[PDB]
């Protein structure tokens, strides 16, 4: 089972650099070329260049020859992509992919800004507050004022996936992000069933668990 592990999201200050890693497992490392792709929202995909984990040979996309630098380390089968003098233009999701591109890393979201990190505040979205409607009930968690993206949400430690809606994040005017994750369940499960949203914000090393009880 080929798995390309890529580091967590990175918040980088303008003008600095960052070293993204891509550790290979489940196959002979020095056996395949490794690529790196850059992806921005509502933007095409871009090939940065590739590297030979065996020879050291490297080839670049003429446009990224000055900002990207590719390397590897056989002892750890880990590939590395360093970016320099970063600007908001380098903000994006970077991926590492095998030679033929049949295996992709999950991706590392990179944001370039002078703004500091900030973990999210999580508030409960009380089930059918007071007035208990009929049939199915909705509830959730408001995750807000965190920076930068991304933030992960799960219900009951991944135990709950049915009827879960995690909305795309929106940049508030404060320059801080916010979003809600909701789930619809049978109103008779309330009170008896405990709904807990697990929010994670790796950039701030924040990890929150919040119980959602029927509005009182």
């Amino acid at each position: 089972q080929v798995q390309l592990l890529e580091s967590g999201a990175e918040l980088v200050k303008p003008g600095a650099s960052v070293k993204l890693s891509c550790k290979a497992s489940g196959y002979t490392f020095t056996s395949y070329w490794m690529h790196w792709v850059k992806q921005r929202p509502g933007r095409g995909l871009e090939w940065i260049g590739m590297i030979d984990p065996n020879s050291g040979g490297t080839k670049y996309n003429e446009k990224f020859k000055s900002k990207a630098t590719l390397t590897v380390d056989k002892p750890s089968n880990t590939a590395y992509m360093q970016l320099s003098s970063l600007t908001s233009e380098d903000s994006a999701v970077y991926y590492c992919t095998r030679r033929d591109m049949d295996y992709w890393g999950a991706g590392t979201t990179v944001t370039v800004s002078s703004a500091s990190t900030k973990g999210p505040s999580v508030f409960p979205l009380a089930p059918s507050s007071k007035s208990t409607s009929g049939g199915t009930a909705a509830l959730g968690c408001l995750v807000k004022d965190y920076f930068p993206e991304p933030v992960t949400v799960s219900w009951n430690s991944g135990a709950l996936t049915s009827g879960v809606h995690t909305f795309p994040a929106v940049l508030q005017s404060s320059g801080l992000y916010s979003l809600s994750s909701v789930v619809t369940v049978p109103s008779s499960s309330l009170g008896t069933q405990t709904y807990i949203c697990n929010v994670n914000h790796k950039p701030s090393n924040t990890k929150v668990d919040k119980k959602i009880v029927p509005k009182s």
Partner: protein
Amino acid sequence: ELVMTQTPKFMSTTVGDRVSITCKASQNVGTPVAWYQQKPGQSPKLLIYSASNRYTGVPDRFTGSGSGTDFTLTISNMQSEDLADYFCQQYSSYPLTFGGGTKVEIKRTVAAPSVFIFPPSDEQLKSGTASVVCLLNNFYPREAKVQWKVDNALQSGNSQESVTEQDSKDSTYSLSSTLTLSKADYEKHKVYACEVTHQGLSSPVTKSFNRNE
């Protein structure tokens, strides 16, 4: 650079109907062309290589065609599992290039949203602000209008909206409207209402509550 021009940018199609995506090469490439599928939140998946070679595990529903500078991806039978983005690639010459992509969505019958309202939590109020959230669950088409009303005053500029990508099980969309007010403004007012106008509604439904307590 051997630019790959992909079209259309957007396409909507009924489950059961067919879809075609095309990539025009600025120069001659021959046969080294590929295609990828990417759903929201995941990474690209290899779908086809060699212009018409279908990667293992990929259904015959997908078929790559063409040669030279004209290439095409076809979904002979659009299904729920095909809801995603599509990218073409060219690897006959360096640097490797991708196509601009195609957001492939599903066309279905109109569906009215189920509406819920969420008063701010006690916890948040002592922070100095309030969030009032209105939810439009499982509806179609995407297009929707949500207006807020407090003490009957039509709020403006104080609410933000977010819309989910099309759902694979329902082929529907969902939306949230969040109203942000100060603990002050919020404690001096009482009736908070969310009004939803949508094609599947013969007249706009409204969800509201009182600042109970």
